[PDB]
Amino acid sequence: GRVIRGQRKGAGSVFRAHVKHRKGAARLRAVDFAERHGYIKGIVKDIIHDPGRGAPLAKVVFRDPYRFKKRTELFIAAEGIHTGQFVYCGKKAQLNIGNVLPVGTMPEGTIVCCLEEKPGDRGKLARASGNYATVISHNPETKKTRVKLPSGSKKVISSANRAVVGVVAGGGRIDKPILKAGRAYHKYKAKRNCWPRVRGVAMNPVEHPFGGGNHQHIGKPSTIRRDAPAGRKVGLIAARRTGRLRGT
């Protein structure tokens, strides 16, 4: 009879992202004339740590092509780039780690960093540390490119979508065991209020569908249908299978 946890997360109040010390939105530069027809050279000025993100951010300074000013970008750092390096963004940029260039003008096996989901926005795909997307096949007609996402899914996107060449830095961060509950506390203190997770079976029936009982048991199939209302769909949501994944 009480609003469950997870339902309370959408209201935002306490479950909002801890963005006080974050360094800004990590994005490619907005597509313009120089990047659409040639290349623009920028210099990597600093590589910084973004709180709540396990991927380094690269501060890249460009020249404004229309007024006497310096533009500062906050690229997602591909592994191997260093401060003082020159990065080149545009259609005519060559294949090097850190350069930003459209996927349609790339070989058939190149693997990219900060992929655009739509032709014009900033990077949206393969942004988490150690991740990348592979270019599978182009087709000169209808301006389409097929890419492999970190999840293994295949996606068809426009050939005009831009991406950084290489793999985002941060490597195998998940390989290290956290070991200590406190280390997980510090990890999630810089992210949001989500970490100390109470099991639903340990709750009372009023605050969870799995709550209650003289033994801690679910009492009903944990797999729940897709169209179940909020406050009910807990457990394995719309699960195609359960068990152990033996075979793939």
Question: CA 119, CA 27: separation in Å to the nearest integer?
Answer: 14
Q: Which CB, 158 or 222, lies closer to K ion?
A: 222
Any idea how long the chain is? 248
Q: Could you write out the DSSP letters of every residue in 49-86?
A: PPTT-SS-EEEEEEE-SSSS-EEEEEEEPBTT--TT-E
* 141 binding RNA? (CB under 7 A): no
Which of residues 47 and 92 has its CB atom nearest to RNA in the complex? 47
Give least dist CB 4 to Mg ion, A.
9
Residue 86 near RNA by CB under 7 A: no
Binding partner at 215 among K ion, Mg ion, RNA, none, C-beta below 5 to 8 Å by kind: RNA
User: Residue 181, exposed/middle/buried by CB under 10 A (0-12, 13-18, 19+)?
Assistant: exposed
Among 83, 137, 139, 151, binds RNA (CB under 7 A): 151
98 touches, from Mg ion, RNA, K ion, none (C-beta below 5 to 8 Å by class): none
Q: Which residues pair with 224 in a beta bridge?
A: 237
Cβ contacts of residue 205 below 8 Å, gap of 6+? 211, 212
220 binds, among RNA, K ion, Mg ion, none (CB under 5 to 8 A by kind): RNA
Q: Which stretch binds Mg ion (CB under 5 A): 103-111, 152-160, 198-206, 233-241?
A: 198-206
Q: Burial, 122: exposed, middle or buried (Cβ in 10 Å; 0-12, 13-18, 19+)? A: buried
- CA–CA separation, 122 and 105 (whole Å): 18
Give the contact letters, 191-220, x = binds to K ion (CB under 5 A), - = no. -------------------------xx---
Task: Pick out residues in 3-32 that bind RNA (CB under 7 A).
Answer: 3-27
Residue 93: both structure tokens together: 């940029």
- Of 32 and 117, the one with the shorter C-beta distance to RNA is 117
The contact set with Mg ion (CB under 5 A) reads: 197, 199, 205, 210-213, 216
